[PDB]
Design a protein around this ligand. Structure first.
Ligand code: CL
Ligand code: CL
Ligand code: CL
Ligand code: CL
Ligand code: NA
Lengths: 102, 102, 102
């Protein structure tokens, strides 16, 4: 399986996007939590509150998930970071595989 | 070393489990913070407040740690995710090894 | 690209360090959020509020970044954890590499 990390400007957009992803079953679940971001943007260091999202899904769904997030994301250049899971308990992996599209 | 990510339904269970893992020297430490979870569960997209836990330990302790968490976890199907650390400062690694059993 | 995870004792140090790393373009950005750390100290399990920081940068900047964090960090034995990113949207990766030193 894989973990996908992305960030949103607010709770409204984060919740809307994540719910759509769940409805389309591109992910089995998401963990949302606030954070403060500091980043470079056109010659200036920006500071913004964001809602970070940890999405969990199947490895084979990466491409489709990434594309969908791109179409739904409020940011023009969002962060869609994929981290492969080296191992996970099989009983959980089963639930995840079962709850994701196939 | 490795990082292990798991979630709990509340702070009570999260603390109990983490402290048990520490007393048994299966992990060097943990980072816990709340998050809003959205997931599929028997035909419904559940929304709940959870406590996410980031555990740090040695690679050779993974299996034993995974099985121990399965026994202690309040969730019937908990997420026990392993992510290998590609590199880390040496002093921290040495500290982590000294803190974990064997 | 890679993600580097470290923790700080407070927001003052977290933001000062992160802003310095950005100014020197060792990272493209960072996400900071509080958490509760659990670890052994003085013979017992201690709980401490910390500010976790997720930094995003290029793989080739790892060594320089790690050494810089060591020089700036308030902790004597800080956690400087590198986790390689398996995949990421390429428009974000293009942005990230163009904002970091070289
Ligand atoms: Cl998978
Ligand atoms: Cl996190
Ligand atoms: Cl080192
Ligand atoms: Cl892309
Ligand atoms: Na990896």
């Amino acid at each position: 399986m894989i973990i996908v990390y992305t960030t949103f400007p607010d709770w409204e957009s984060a919740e809307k996007v994540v719910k759509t992803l769940l409805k389309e079953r591109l992910i089995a679940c998401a963990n949302l939590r606030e954070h403060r971001a500091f980043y470079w943007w056109e010659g200036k260091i920006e500071e913004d509150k964001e809602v970070g999202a940890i999405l969990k899904t199947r490895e084979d769904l990466w491409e489709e998930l990434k594309e969908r997030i791109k179409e739904l994301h409020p940011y023009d250049v969002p962060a869609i970071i994929r981290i492969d899971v080296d191992d996970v308990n099989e009983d959980y992996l089963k639930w995840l595989i079962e709850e994701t599209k196939k």
